């Protein structure tokens, strides 16, 4: 049980460190750090597998009405060197009319 064990039965076992001749390579990854690494990789691969399923089973004739108010991801040919697959969003700025810029420049 738990009362049938001495304090030397309860005593913790210490963890060894990376050798000092090899400490420049980083920390020695043990089971806990390996579990963190494996959890992050399995999570990222699960998201990527779901994205690959969604890109495979895509209707080529789909029509949402946000397509008339968004700029598409395009291709590398149409966009150019600045091509990421992400749809570009708006930063909030807008082209500003001349009367309001006349007001702002009088204030400045």
């Amino acid at each position: 049980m738990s009362s049938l064990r001495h304090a030397i039965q309860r005593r913790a076992h210490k963890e060894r460190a990376q050798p000092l001749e090899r400490q420049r390579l980083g920390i020695l990854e043990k089971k806990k750090d390996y579990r963190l690494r494996a959890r992050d990789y399995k999570k990222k691969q699960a998201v990527l597998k779901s994205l690959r399923q969604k890109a495979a089973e895509r209707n080529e004739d789909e029509f949402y009405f946000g397509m008339m108010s968004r700029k598409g991801p395009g291709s590398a040919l149409t966009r150019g060197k600045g091509f990421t697959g992400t749809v570009d969003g708006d930063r909030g700025n807008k082209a500003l009319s001349v009367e309001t810029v006349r007001l702002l420049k009088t204030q400045d």
Partner: protein, 119 residues
């Protein structure tokens, strides 16, 4: 059901009825007659209609917009344009419903994807 269970014509017409309903897309399985007991349903027919099946295929966004688009006549099923919003799309014509020839909705999709070929 009321026929005896080891009957040849019962077994043959069970397979015929289940295959016919699964080919029309009403049932989702073809291995139970309780599907025709409590799964065949006027809502199953009405969701095999055309604006709901293109809502599911994401040709439109909502069934209201889909009924508006197939009343304006952008949607063909196969090779023939469909103006009736009650055309029951079966399971093998859900692979052939698409936009019409000179469609402005098709130009909108191609203009979004930046593949607007004007030829």
């Amino acid at each position: 059901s009321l026929l005896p269970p080891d009957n040849e014509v019962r077994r043959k017409h069970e397979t015929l009825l289940l295959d016919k309903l699964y080919d029309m897309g009403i049932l989702s399985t073809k291995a139970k007659l309780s599907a025709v007991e409590h799964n065949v349903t006027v809502s199953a027919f009405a969701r095999r209609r055309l604006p709901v099946v293109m809502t599911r295929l994401r040709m439109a966004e909502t069934v209201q917009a889909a009924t508006k688009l197939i009343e304006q006549g952008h949607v063909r099923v196969g090779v023939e344009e469909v103006r009736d919003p009650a055309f029951l799309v079966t399971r093998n014509m859900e692979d052939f419903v698409t936009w019409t020839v000179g469609s402005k909705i098709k130009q909108n999709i191609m203009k979004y994807r930046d593949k607007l070929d004007d030829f």
